[PDB]
Each structure stands twice: as C-alpha cells, then as structure tokens.
Amino acid sequence: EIAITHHVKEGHEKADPSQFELLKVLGQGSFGKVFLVKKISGSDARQLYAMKVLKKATLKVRDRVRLVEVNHPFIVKLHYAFQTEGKLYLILDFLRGGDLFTRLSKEVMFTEEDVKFYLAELALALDHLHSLGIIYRDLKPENILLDEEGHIKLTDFGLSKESHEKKAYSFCGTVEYMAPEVVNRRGHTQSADWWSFGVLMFEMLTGTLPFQGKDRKETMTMILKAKLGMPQFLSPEAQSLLRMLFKRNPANRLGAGPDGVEEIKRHSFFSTIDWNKLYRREIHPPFKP
Amino acid sequence: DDDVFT
Numbered sequence: 681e682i683a684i685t686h687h688v689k690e691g692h693e694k695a696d697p698s699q700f701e702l703l704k705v706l707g708q709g710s711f712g713k714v715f716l717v718k719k720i721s722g723s724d725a726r727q728l729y730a731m732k733v734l735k736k737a738t739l740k741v742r743d744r745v746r747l748v749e750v751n752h753p754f755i756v757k758l759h760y761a762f763q764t765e766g767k768l769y770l771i772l773d774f775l776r777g778g779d780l781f782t783r784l785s786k787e788v789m790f791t792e793e794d795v796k797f798y799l800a801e802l803a804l805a806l807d808h809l810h811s812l813g814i815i816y817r818d819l820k821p822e823n824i825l826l827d828e829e830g831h832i833k834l835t836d837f838g839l840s841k842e843s844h845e846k847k848a849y850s851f852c853g854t855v856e857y858m859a860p861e862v863v864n865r866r867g868h869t870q871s872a873d874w875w876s877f878g879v880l881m882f883e884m885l886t887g888t889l890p891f892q893g894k895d896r897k898e899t900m901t902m903i904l905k906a907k908l909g910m911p912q913f914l915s916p917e918a919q920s921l922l923r924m925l926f927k928r929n930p931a932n933r934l935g936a937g938p939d940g941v942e943e944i945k946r947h948s949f950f951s952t953i954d955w956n957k958l959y960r961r962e963i964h965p966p967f968k969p
Numbered sequence: 970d971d972d973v974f975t
C-alpha cells in the first residue's frame with residue numbers, strides 16, 4: 681500500500697474536509713480522479729487546489745529542519761494531508777495535464793544535452809527544498825513529475841510502497857538511491873540528496889542503476905563497498921560530475937560545501953545552462969508531453 | 970573507498 685510523507689512547516693494550520701469548496705472533478709490520466717477545490721478559510725482562503733482522496737494509504741508527518749511561502753517553478757507542494765473515515769485527503773498544487781517522469785524515461789533515450797536540462801531544473805528544485813528544511817533521503821524518479829509544458833515538478837512530499845508480520849518502520853526508502861550514510865542509518869544531511877542526484881544522473885545517462893544486487897542486502901553492500909567502472913562513452917564533463925557526486929564521505933561530496941548547490945551549478949557539465957533563464961521557464965524542454 | 974569509480 682501507499683505511504684505519504686508530509687513535511688510540515690512550523691505552525692501548520694491543520695485542515696479537514698469542511699474547509700474546501702468543491703469546484704470540478706477531472707480525469708487526469710496517470711493522476712486518476714482529481715478534485716479541483718477552493719480553500720474556504722485561513723491564510724490561503726480562496727486559493728484553488730487539487731484534491732486526491734486515497735482509500736488505502738498511510739500518512740507520516742515529519743518536521744522540517746528549517747515567511748509566507750511562494751510558488752517555485754519546479755516544485756509541486758503538498759499543502760494539507762488529513763485522515764477521515766478510512767480516507768486520506770491530499771491537498772496539492774493543481775497540476776493540469778501533468779505526467780510522470782518515469783513515463784518519459786521509458787519512452788526516450790536521453791543524450792547528455794537532454795540530461796543537462798532535466799538535472800538543471802531538478803537541482804534548482806532540490807536546493808529550494810533544502811532551504812525549506814526538507815531532506816529527501818531517497819530521492820528517486822517516482823518523486824519527479826512533469827508539467828503540461830514538459831518542465832520538472834519535484835514533489836515536496838514522500839511516497840513509498842510499504843507492506844503484518846513485517847514490523848513497521850518510520851522511514852522505508854528505496855535502497856538503490858540511498859547514500860552510504862543513509863544506508864548505515866548514521867547520517868542524513870542534505871549532502872545525502874546530492875548522492876541521490878548522482879544516481880538519478882547515472883540512470884538517465886545509462887538507463888541502468890550504478891548499484892544493484894540480487895536483494896536489498898547485496899545492494900547495501902555495494903553502496904558501501906563496490907568499486908564501479910565509469911562508463912567510457914560519457915563525456916569527460918559527465919564523468920567528472922559523477923565522480924564528484926559519488927564520494928562516500930558526505931563531507932567530500934559536491935554540493936556539501938558552504939556554497940551548496942552553486943558547486944554543482946558551476947561544474948563544467950552545466951556550463952551551457954543559463955540559470956536565470958531556466959528559473960524563468962524560458963528554456964524549452966527536450967521533449968514536449 | 971571514498972572514490973566510488975576508477
């Protein structure tokens with residue numbers, strides 16, 4: 681079944697179904713049945729939202745690490761999440777005609793030029809979440825959506841497929857995307873997310889995962905100890921970025937220094953990106969949905 | 970090893 685992780689901000693005004701006026705019912709393809717709703721009260725009174733009503737889902741609520749919040753071009757937010765009579769209500773940024781990044785990844789072969797675009801928007805999104813106090817731990821393609829124009833929309837919430845004899849865990853993630861210090865349950869600083877960013881990059885460029893074993897135990901061992909062959913068809917710039925992200929010591933990883941994501945934005949792999957034009961949504965995606 | 974590749 682599905683587990684949603686809501687990273688709540690300090691002073692979250694908890695909600696309930698009576699706080700939302702119902703406006704439309706949509707079929708949104710991969711998103712299924714979505715309700716368009718209008719917030720009735722509180723600071724965001726009159727705001728329009730998407731609503732999902734899930735019947736078999738668990739809710740986990742976590743504190744951010746950490747002003748009125750502003751929309752980011754490459755993030756969709758979970759604004760409210762509450763349970764009622766066996767139903768889980770999700771109040772989300774409305775994402776008209778959105779789709780899944782995994783759907784695009786299955787259909788296309790990414791070139792380095794393609795990957796530069798998607799990873800650039802994702803780096804802006806991921807760093808913005810860091811500034812809001814959200815560390816992903818197991819950032820993965822399931823967290824990445826695409827809007828109707830083809831731009832990245834990183835979800836600011838967690839989503840896991842968690843299965844009674846099995847004891848429950850407060851954090852259940854996908855091992856293939858977890859940094860070593862996360863695998864060890866010994867650290868989970870924002871630097872862990874830049875390792876996962878590297879896994880994403882590697883998977884986009886090669887269509888394969890860098891660390892994968894027969895079972896979750898062998899994958900852990902590889903993340904901690906394997907020496908990986910760097911694919912030689914990759915450009916010198918792509919190889920350099922992967923090497924700098926795939927440092928086992930989180931303190932030595934690109935993105936972990938004081939300038940954070942700027943260490944990544946300055947890397948030669950992204951040298952063609954105009955980060956201001958990118959933030960203004962003025963650069964067209966390689967694929968249009 | 971701190972370096973994963975090479």
Ligand SMILES: C[C@@H]1O[C@@H](Oc2c(-c3ccc(O)c(O)c3)oc3cc(O)cc(O)c3c2=O)[C@H](O)[C@H](O)[C@H]1O
Pocket residue numbers: 682710711712713714730731732756757770772773774775780822823824825835839
């Ligand atoms: C909670 C998710 O809601 C629905 O999809 C949405 C998702 C979504 C997110 C991550 C995924 O991996 C994924 O497969 C879907 O995200 C949304 C974000 C919005 O801002 C608005 C939405 O309506 C959805 C939205 O409707 C789908 O029913 C999905 O099966 C369910 O897991």
